[PDB]
Design a protein around this ligand. Structure first.
Ligand SMILES: [Fe+3]
Length: 306
């Protein structure tokens, strides 16, 4: 039980090249079988990775009243906390420099150029990794001519989750089982492990914290008509130390729609089209939390599997 490891060294990785075609096959197979993979990413230096970790702590160290200024939508960017367990919040529209500048001046009226420049740089570099990976998936399904339309006005999110020292060694649950509602999520654990995936079998893979982890969200699973797997995951601390994760999410401009090419006799249409803002909100309500672990419990489900 160990994840695929995919070398996304940007060197040599241009469309049409030999290395690109090899990496494309690895990405498609990993996201079909596991829904995730460890990724070696040099689009971001170790120096920038540590700077973004420091910026996450600086944001989460602000007063509660300041963090609340980022709104009441914890399904996307809003401040969330389970007392004595975890806290988190996000920078929405991280690839829009004007939106990052506004967010920064909301949090730091006297200014914080270091925070704004660091997080925008990381968001831009990780969005290119997301773009390349989606492109490889589209190419793998014969859909490269539909790719630019899919990607128009992609929404990117940078999200920090912090986990308090659990007070014990061994094993301390810290975040509950869910599927992400992104297209892709790219996670860095900042040298402390705990992210844990359920296999299709029902086994558990707890990777080390040396590399980025790519995982599929329910938007890509729906786009693929269930051909790709969105994996169930949770966080379990394995040591008495604090943990901060840095995660990059892609979301569509508005609608996800499954292309006709991926529907056939053996693969009936699983999901009607749906709006991401509605899905995200719904999963955070009492009546809609059934959809957190399974998009088939959402209103878009066709009932095809009877
Ligand atoms: Fe997640």
């Amino acid at each position: 039980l160990r994840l695929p490891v995919i070398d996304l060294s940007m060197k040599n990785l241009k469309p049409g090249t030999t290395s690109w075609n090899s990496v494309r096959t690895q990405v498609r197979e990993a996201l079909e079988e596991y829904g995730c993979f460890e990724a070696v990413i040099d689009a971001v230096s170790p120096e920038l990775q540590k700077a973004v970790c420091n910026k996450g702590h600086e944001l989460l160290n602000l007063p509660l009243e300041t963090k609340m200024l980022n709104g009441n939508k914890p399904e996307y960017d809003g401040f969330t906390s389970i007392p004595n367990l975890n806290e988190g919040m996000g920078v929405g529209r991280i690839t829009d420099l004007e939106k990052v500048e506004r967010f920064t001046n909301l949090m730091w009226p006297e200014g914080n150029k270091d925070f704004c420049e660091t997080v925008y740089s990381y968001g831009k570099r990780m969005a290119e990794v997301d773009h390349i990976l989606k492109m490889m998936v589209f190419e793998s399904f014969g859909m490269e001519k539909h790719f630019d339309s899919f990607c128009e006005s992609t929404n990117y999110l940078l999200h920090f989750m912090r986990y308090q020292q659990p007070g014990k060694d061994g094993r301390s649950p810290a975040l509950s089982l869910h599927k992400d509602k992104s297209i892709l999520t790219i996670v860095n654990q900042n040298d402390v492990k705990g992210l844990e995936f359920e296999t299709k079998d029902g086994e558990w893979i707890l990777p080390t914290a040396d590399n980025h982890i790519v995982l599929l969200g329910d938007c890509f699973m729906a786009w693929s008509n269930g051909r790709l797997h969105s994996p169930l995951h949770r966080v379990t601390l394995v040591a008495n130390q604090a943990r901060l994760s840095t995660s990059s999410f892609s979301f569509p401009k508005d609608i996800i729609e499954t292309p006709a090419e991926l529907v056939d006799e053996e693969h009936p249409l699983l999901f009607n089209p749906f709006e991401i803002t509605e899905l995200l909100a719904y999963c955070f309500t009492k009546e809609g939390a059934k959809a957190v672990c399974d998009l088939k419990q959402y209103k878009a489900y066709t009932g095809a599997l009877e």
